[PDB]
């Protein structure tokens, strides 16, 4: 068979928990295909998205082998947790919106992507590097580096999936991960910077020895440490930027300032650590490792000559240069400039101060900042406290900005949270703080006080068109607070453009009014006639969506007097307000169903209906309300034909399944699109025994439904080890002998399942244990093929026959050879000893079959019995011969001590020496020295007599040229050094024919073998036959004989002509080989090319060399190049010779001119061309 196979390895691969996460990983790849997971997870919880992913993966054809090996089963909570992590990551990377984080994230991702990918690729290589270090002097350095890397990536994995609040709490904690990352240490006193500097200081990475393997490992560890240090730098940078912008958007100025300072400090320190402050003292480590790599690259004797070493060091140099250029490109991260605060403050407006935050006994502080849209600015230090007595609104005099930038102003009262109060232009001085007070007045929970404050501030010239909180205006503030009088006054004497102005997130005043459930102002807004079908910029919701989500009934009732309202407005994922009303509850579902124009059976992009979401949510009252509505399609399906009852079955909800079954119009026989799977199939597939048992006892449920591949619920129960399901189905009376399309019996699946204990229960019921598989196999016959030895013993004790025939001639005795189940063989031979040497259709024996699978523990057992040692197959494989290819030197000595035949030849003709030579195993040829007594070096083989050119020939000398055949340097050098009889096969000449540059490179210098050779054949003569470019160029330089021609007048230049080697002719013409020297036959090589009728040669050969070779040469035939083109019917070259100016007036002895050749031989087409040219 094939030595490389993963079918046996698929047992642990499928059952591997890491590959179970790969099943999660492909499930994690589903969120890329379908984007409806998040919003749906907002409606019915995270229980919906994982269910959709599971149904999508399980909707297709069920594979027998994959389901059998066990990784068709996966706990649902494991998928749910990964969806939690992904949703949390997406939400974290979405709430923080700012151009500053946009630029910082773009920079960090384009900086890290490649180094992160290569570090992930080389993680396992470094892991195997860890165990390869044995020296005590260097071991601590690699230990520290590995410990730091493990801490770093474990911490990243732990921190990646947490929620935003948990993210903030974990990042903001005493002795946290960031604190350990700043100075690059760990709680278990592990650091890498000091070892990284120490290893460079002494330089153990230099390859002092010819190999110096430990030096290469140390250099690899140094590279790993450098990449990890860059990665932790960028992780710290991005985390600090995220924290800073989060706390700036929240409104905490002090914490944003401290994170700003920390980010600047860490950036400066890491930059000084990598590139150095002018690299005067080589503080930076990037240039140090760069110079170390340059030195080791320039070193030649120290190098190991390996081709991959050059490529990997080139990649490292390129990557380090790119990252160094990226780091040195920027000289600052944030804007550290500080503005100038107010120069004078007064209280000019006559406003008594029981208003707003202005109270007697309070103090006020002010601060200024540069308004930057691309970088992070810094807030000025807070000014001196100003007491508040009898005056509320102050006036600030601002000096003209030097840089002429707009300045943001912040105000703080006592220890309260700072608030942004406005913006000041470079050319305006008198700034009045009265605009934000109106905004706060409109947000007052009290109505009378808020209205009075609003009127008082508006009477003194307060701007009502100022945005304060991400685009929110006074209209939004009145909408959120619900002030009826303020909203009425704002709507009156106003313009429609203010009432429909969205904020930075797309929320309009009607959106805010509906979100907060303020129906009294929604009525006024509708009466004024504002736009209602507006949508949020990102998530695309209307006020109806928000009202349904929050469950406000009066808001909806006041929203339904709008003539323009549209109930069936959709969203980004196509969900309707009725879909959102499931979270609202019965009080809002009844309000929706009361409306005439409700579309109860609306479908989303995936095809989900409100009934589907209600069933998935496991909330029965909403489903009962929907059933109370008379327009519900119970059997509605989705894009994959998944019914709500299928969802209930696959999520294992017993109560909802019972309630759905009791429905009169329910249909339990609906199936999927590509799988034809019913809900019962899903129940047994996910091993929810209670719901499956309830379904199988239902009258309207068919347990005999059939799907793709001939799959019935009985087969699933048998293969997945559901004992209670099997017992219940036995009680019901399900047919036992049901067969699939490929007709696997249930007993076969029981014998192939991971729970063998089932099969005996089947034996209780009675099954055709002698039934043949579609491939002519019995349960005992095919059991050993998979390799479950433990399940085979219990079947053998039932007195099952040990003699059988199939199309392949295999039996359990044969099947044990491939897997090496010695425990099965511990009883087979004991019962019957007449099986050790037998034959089948393909002429194989267990000795042969076990040999090619390399089972040492089983192969040695058969020699004790006395099996045939020289058995053969149609391919000629033998137990001794197959092991030569593998090269397992450990046990080959066990076979030679059983006085076997000296060699065995296949149909092609070979012995165990050659496959060692063919595959280049140096161990085997060394061992042959100890059997010079057993094996004769001068033995001659007659099987391959025809191959050797003359008489009969020895086996030994072909091994030299066969080593040359696959350019095995190790084998050929042993023959030259240790044997003086290596020149009989002529390695130099054969290597040139087969074009092995390495062999001819090695043999020339130290051996000083003659280039010409001791025979008429020369390496150049044979090299030109096969047209190999590399061999010719090296053999030219040292000097060689090229002018003299080989036998039968077949020279080197003509050899490339016949085979049409364009590249070979290019170089051979540079040497200026004499083309005038005629061959043995008498035809010049220039004329010989036309004899072969080479059309392509005239393009290049003629133009370059013309002075040495005249165009009027003749052969013994005495016909020019035009005559040959006449005979071969090729007009392309006929028109080329005349253009080049050849002579055609010379006549041979045939006394027939060129025109007469085309006339006497009846070539009418070419007569015209020659006549016109001739005068």
**Length of the chain, in residues:** 1175
| Residues whose CB is less than 8 angstroms from the CB of residue 469 and which lie 6 or more positions away in sequence, other chains included | none
Which DSSP helix (H) or strand (E) runs through 320?
helix 307-329
Angle at 766 between CA 762 and CA 769, to 5 degrees: 80
**Alpha-carbon span 924 to 109, nearest angstrom:** 53
Tell me the two tokens of residue 865. Answer: 């019995």
Strands lying side by side in the sheet with 395-397: 344-346, 395-397, 430-432
Do residues 558 and 519 lie in contact, with contact meaning Cβ atoms separated by under 8 Å? yes
Do residues 144 and 221 lie in contact, with contact meaning Cβ atoms separated by under 8 Å? no
Establish how many alpha carbons lie within 13 A of residue 624's alpha carbon, considering only the half-sphere containing its beta carbon: 10
**Alpha-carbon span 606 to 604, nearest angstrom:** 5
Region label for 887, one of left (φ > 0), alpha (ψ between -120 and 50) or beta (otherwise): left
Do residues 622 and 585 lie in contact, with contact meaning Cβ atoms separated by under 8 Å? yes
What one-character DSSP code corresponds to residue 374?
S
Do residues 232 and 181 lie in contact, with contact meaning Cβ atoms separated by under 8 Å? yes
Do residues 479 and 509 lie in contact, with contact meaning Cβ atoms separated by under 8 Å? yes
**Alpha-carbon span 380 to 396, nearest angstrom:** 16
Q: Residue written as tokens 């019957």?
A: 832
Region label for 1047, one of left (φ > 0), alpha (ψ between -120 and 50) or beta (otherwise): beta
**Alpha-carbon span 394 to 432, nearest angstrom:** 6
How far is C-alpha 810 from the geometric centre of its chain's CA atoms? Answer: 41
For 430, the 3-state DSSP assignment is: strand
**Alpha-carbon span 382 to 471, nearest angstrom:** 26
**Alpha-carbon span 186 to 104, nearest angstrom:** 27
Q: Is 980 exposed, middle or buried (0-12, 13-18, 19+ CB in 10 A)?
A: exposed
Return the CA Rg of the chain: 44
Q: Residue written as tokens 């100038």?
A: 340
Region label for 37, one of left (φ > 0), alpha (ψ between -120 and 50) or beta (otherwise): alpha
| DSSP one-letter string for 757-776 | HHHHHHHHH---TTPPPTTS
Phi then psi dihedrals of residue 69, to 5 deg: -75, -10
524-546 burial, b for 16+ CB within 10 Å, e for fewer? bbbeeebebebbbeeebbbbbbb
Q: Residue written as tokens 């008429």?
A: 1016
The closest of 276, 194, 259, 189 to 229, measured between CA atoms, is 194
Tell me the structure's resolution in angstroms, rounded to a single decimal.
Answer: 2.7
**Alpha-carbon span 471 to 411, nearest angstrom:** 19
**Alpha-carbon span 579 to 559, nearest angstrom:** 18
Distances (CA, A) of 1058 to 92, 329, 597, 1020, 1026: 71, 59, 86, 16, 10
Residue 940 bridge partners (DSSP) = 954
**Alpha-carbon span 856 to 911, nearest angstrom:** 22
Do residues 357 and 413 lie in contact, with contact meaning Cβ atoms separated by under 8 Å? yes
- Experiment type: cryo-EM
Region label for 1027, one of left (φ > 0), alpha (ψ between -120 and 50) or beta (otherwise): left
For 948, the 3-state DSSP assignment is: coil
Do residues 620 and 655 lie in contact, with contact meaning Cβ atoms separated by under 8 Å? yes
For 469, the 3-state DSSP assignment is: strand
Q: Is 138 exposed, middle or buried (0-12, 13-18, 19+ CB in 10 A)?
A: buried
**Alpha-carbon span 577 to 583, nearest angstrom:** 10
How far is C-alpha 560 from the geometric centre of its chain's CA atoms? Answer: 51
**Alpha-carbon span 733 to 742, nearest angstrom:** 23
Which DSSP helix (H) or strand (E) runs through 786?
helix 779-786
Distances (CA, A) of 537 to 571, 575, 961: 11, 16, 76
**Alpha-carbon span 1122 to 1133, nearest angstrom:** 8
Sign of CA dihedral 1080, 1086, 1087, 1089: positive
Q: Residue written as tokens 């706990």?
A: 75
Tell me the two tokens of residue 913. Answer: 């020496």
Do residues 796 and 764 lie in contact, with contact meaning Cβ atoms separated by under 8 Å? no
Q: Where are the alpha helices (DSSP H) in 1040-1118?
A: 1052-1059, 1062-1068, 1085-1091, 1097-1104
Tell me the two tokens of residue 404. Answer: 């002429």
Angle at 442 between CA 523 and CA 446, to 5 degrees: 85
Which DSSP helix (H) or strand (E) runs through 431?
strand 430-432
Do residues 1086 and 1113 lie in contact, with contact meaning Cβ atoms separated by under 8 Å? yes
Do residues 684 and 692 lie in contact, with contact meaning Cβ atoms separated by under 8 Å? yes
**Alpha-carbon span 604 to 700, nearest angstrom:** 30
Which DSSP helix (H) or strand (E) runs through 89?
helix 76-95
**Alpha-carbon span 879 to 1097, nearest angstrom:** 54
Phi then psi dihedrals of residue 1053, to 5 deg: -65, -35
Region label for 1135, one of left (φ > 0), alpha (ψ between -120 and 50) or beta (otherwise): alpha
Which DSSP helix (H) or strand (E) runs through 553?
helix 553-559
Q: 974-979 — which CB contacts under 8 Å span 24+ positions?
A: 974/922, 974/925, 976/1003, 976/1007
Phi then psi dihedrals of residue 421, to 5 deg: -105, -15
Q: Is 597 exposed, middle or buried (0-12, 13-18, 19+ CB in 10 A)?
A: exposed
Q: Where are the alpha helices (DSSP H) in 585-697?
A: 586-594, 610-616, 620-628, 644-651, 654-661, 679-685, 689-696
SS3 string of 723-748? Answer: HHHHHHHHHHCCCCCCCCCCCCCHHH
SS3 string of 1125-1146? Answer: HHHHCCHHHHHHHHHHCCCCCC
**Alpha-carbon span 547 to 512, nearest angstrom:** 10
Q: Beta strand pairing status for 430-432 and 419-424?
A: unpaired
For 565, the 3-state DSSP assignment is: coil
Q: Is 183 exposed, middle or buried (0-12, 13-18, 19+ CB in 10 A)?
A: exposed
Phi then psi dihedrals of residue 1163, to 5 deg: -120, 85
Other CB atoms within 10 Å distance of the CB of residue 841: 11
Which DSSP helix (H) or strand (E) runs through 432?
strand 430-432
Other CB atoms within 10 Å distance of the CB of residue 1026: 16
Angle between helices 164-171 and 213-250 (to 10 degrees): 110
Tell me the two tokens of residue 417. Answer: 């949270």
Tell me the two tokens of residue 310. Answer: 């050059």
Phi then psi dihedrals of residue 580, to 5 deg: -70, -25
């Amino acid at each position: 068979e094939g030595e490389d196979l993963t079918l046996e390895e698929k047992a642990e691969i499928c059952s591997e928990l890491e590959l179970q996460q790969k099943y999660v990983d492909i499930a994690s790849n589903i969120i890329g295909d379908l984007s409806s997971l998040p919003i749906a997870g907002k409606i019915a919880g995270t229980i919906a998205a994982a269910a959709m992913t599971a149904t999508h993966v399980a909707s297709g054809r069920l594979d027998i082998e994959q389901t059998l090996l066990g990784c068709s089963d996966l706990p649902f909570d494991q998928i749910k947790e990964v969806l939690e992590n992904r949703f949390n990551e997406i939400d974290r990377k979405l709430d923080s919106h700012s151009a500053a984080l946009e630029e910082i994230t773009k920079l960090v991702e384009k900086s890290i992507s490649v180094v992160e990918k290569t570090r992930k690729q080389m993680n396992k290589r470094f892991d195997e590097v860890m165990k390869s270090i044995q020296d005590a002097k260097v071991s601590p350095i690699i230990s520290k580096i590995n410990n730091f890397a493990r801490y770093f990536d474990t911490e990243k994995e732990r921190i990646r999936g947490l929620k935003l609040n948990d993210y903030i709490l974990k990042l903001e904690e005493p002795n946290g991960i960031l604190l350990h990352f700043k100075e690059s240490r760990t709680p278990t006193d592990d650091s890498l910077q000091a070892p990284l500097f120490s290893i460079i200081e002494e330089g153990y990475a230099v390859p002092k020895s010819i190999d110096d393997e430990l030096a290469f490992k140390v250099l690899y560890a140094l590279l790993y440490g450098t990449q990890t240090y860059v990665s932790v730098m960028f992780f710290l940078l991005e985390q600090y930027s995220f924290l800073a912008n989060h706390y700036y958007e929240k409104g905490y100025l002090e914490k944003y300032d401290e994170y700003f300072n920390s980010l600047n400090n860490v950036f400066l320190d890491f930059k000084s650590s990598l590139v150095g402050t002018g690299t005067s003292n080589n503080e930076g480590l990037l240039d140090r490792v760069l110079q170390v790599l340059m030195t080791v690259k320039n070193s030649e004797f120290l190098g190991l000559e390996k081709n991959g070493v050059d490529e990997m060091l080139n990649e490292k140099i390129n990557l380090f240069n790119k990252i160094k250029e990226e780091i040195e490109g920027k000289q600052k991260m944030t804007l550290s400039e500080t503005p100038e605060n107010f120069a004078q403050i007064s209280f000019d407006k006559d406003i008594t101060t029981p208003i707003g935050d202005w109270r007697d006994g309070r103090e006020v502080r002010y601060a200024v900042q540069y308004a930057s849209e691309t970088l992070f600015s810094k807030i000025s230090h807070w000014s001196d406290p100003v007491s508040v007595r009898e005056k509320a609104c102050p006036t600030l005099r601002m000096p003209v900005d030097q840089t002429r930038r707009n300045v943001l102003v912040f105000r703080k009262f006592d220890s309260s949270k700072p608030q942004l109060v406005g913006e000041i232009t470079p050319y305006l001085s008198n700034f009045i703080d009265i605009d934000r007070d109106l905004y706060n007045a409109a947000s007052n929970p009290d109505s009378a006080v808020g209205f009075k404050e609003f009127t008082k501030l508006n009477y003194d010239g307060a701007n009502i068109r100022a945005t304060f909180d991400h685009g929110r205006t006074v209209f939004h503030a009145a909408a959120k607070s619900g002030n009826d009088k303020i909203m009425f006054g704002l709507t009156f004497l106003a313009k429609s453009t203010e009432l429909n102005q969205p904020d930075k997130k797309g929320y309009t005043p009607i959106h805010v009014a509906a979100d907060s459930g303020n129906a009294g102002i929604v009525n006024l807004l509708i009466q004024r006639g504002v736009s209602i079908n507006s949508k949020t910029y990102h998530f695309l919701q209307t006020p109806l969506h928000l009202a349904a989500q929050r469950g406000f009934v009066t808001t909806f009732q006041r929203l339904m007097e709008s003539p323009e309202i549209n109930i069936n407005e959709r969203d980004k994922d196509g969900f309707t307000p009725l879909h959102y009303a499931i979270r609202g509850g019965e009080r809002i579902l009844e309000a929706f169903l009361n409306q005439i124009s409700i579309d109860v059976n609306a479908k989303s992009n995936t095809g989900l209906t409100p009934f589907h979401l209600a069933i998935i949510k496991n909330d029965w009252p909403v489903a009962s309300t929907l059933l109370g509505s008379k327009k519900v399609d119970i059997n509605a399906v989705d894009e994959n034909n998944i019914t709500a009852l299928h969802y209930a079955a696959i999520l294992g909800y017993l109560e909802t399944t019972k309630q759905l079954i009791n429905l009169k119009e329910i249909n339990a026989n609906v199936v999927s699109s590509p799988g034809l799977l019913s809900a019962l199939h899903y129940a047994i597939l996910y091993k929810h025994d209670d719901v499956a048992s309830f379904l199988m006892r239902s009258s309207n449920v068919n347990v005999n439904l059939k799907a793709l591949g001939g799959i019935t619920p009985l087969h699933l129960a048998v293969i997945q080890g559901r004992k209670q399901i099997l017992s219940l189905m036995f009680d019901i009376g399900v047919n036992i002998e049901q067969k699939t399309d490929e007709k696997y019996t249930p007993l076969h699946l029981a014998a192939m399942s991971k729970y063998p204990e089932l099969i005996q229960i089947l034996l209780d019921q009675g099954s055709n244990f002698e039934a043949k598989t579609n491939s002519g196999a019995t349960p005992l016959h095919l059991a050993t093929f998979k390799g479950k030895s433990q399940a085979a013993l219990i079947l053998l004790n039932n007195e099952v026959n040990w003699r059988d025939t199939d199309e392949n001639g295999q039996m359990p005795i044969h099947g044990a050879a491939m897997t090496g189940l010695l425990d099965v063989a511990q009883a087979i031979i004991s019962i019957d000893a007449t099986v050790v040497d037998i034959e089948d259709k393909n002429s194989d024996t267990p000795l042969n079959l076990a040999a090619q699978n390399s089972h040492i523990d089983v192969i040695k057992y058969f020699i004790d019995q006395g099996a045939d040692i020289n058995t053969r197959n149609k391919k000629g494989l033998a137990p001794l011969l197959a092991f030569s290819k593998k090269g397992n030197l450990d046990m080959v000595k066990y076979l030679f001590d059983k006085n076997a035949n000296v060699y065995i030849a296949d149909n092609d003709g070979m012995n165990f020496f050659y496959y060692a030579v063919q595959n280049g195993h140096l161990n085997i040829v060394k061992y042959a020295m100890s059997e010079k007594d057993k094996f004769e070096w001068s033995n001659t083989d007659n099987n391959r007599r025809d191959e050797c050119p003359n008489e009969e020939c020895a086996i030994s000398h072909f091994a030299v040229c066969d080593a040359v055949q696959f350019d095995r340097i190790e084998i050929v050098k042993y023959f030259v050094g240790t044997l003086g009889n290596f020149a009989i096969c002529g390695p130099l000449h054969q290597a040139a024919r087969y074009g092995h540059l390495d062999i001819v490179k090695y043999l020339v210098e130290e051996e000083f073998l003659s280039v010409d050779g001791s025979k008429t054949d020369t390496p150049l003569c044979y090299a030109s036959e096969n047209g190999h470019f590399t061999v010719v160029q090296y053999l030219v330089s040292n000097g060689a004989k090229v002018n003299h021609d080989c036998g039968n007048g077949m020279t080197a230049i003509d050899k490339a002509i016949t085979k049409n080697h364009l590249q070979v002719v290019q170089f051979l013409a540079a040497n200026g080989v004499d083309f005038r020297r005629k061959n043995s036959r008498g035809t010049t090589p220039f004329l010989t090319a036309v004899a072969e009728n080479a059309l392509h040669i005239a393009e290049y050969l003629i133009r370059e060399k013309r002075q040495d070779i005249n165009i009027n040469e003749q052969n013994v035939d005495k016909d020019t190049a035009l005559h040959l083109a006449v005979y071969y019917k090729n007009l392309q070259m006929i028109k080329l010779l005349i253009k080049y100016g050849i002579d055609v007036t010379i006549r041979n002895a045939y006394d027939k001119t060129a025109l007469d050749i085309a006339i006497d031989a009846k070539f009418s087409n070419i007569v015209e061309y020659l006549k016109t040219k001739s005068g």
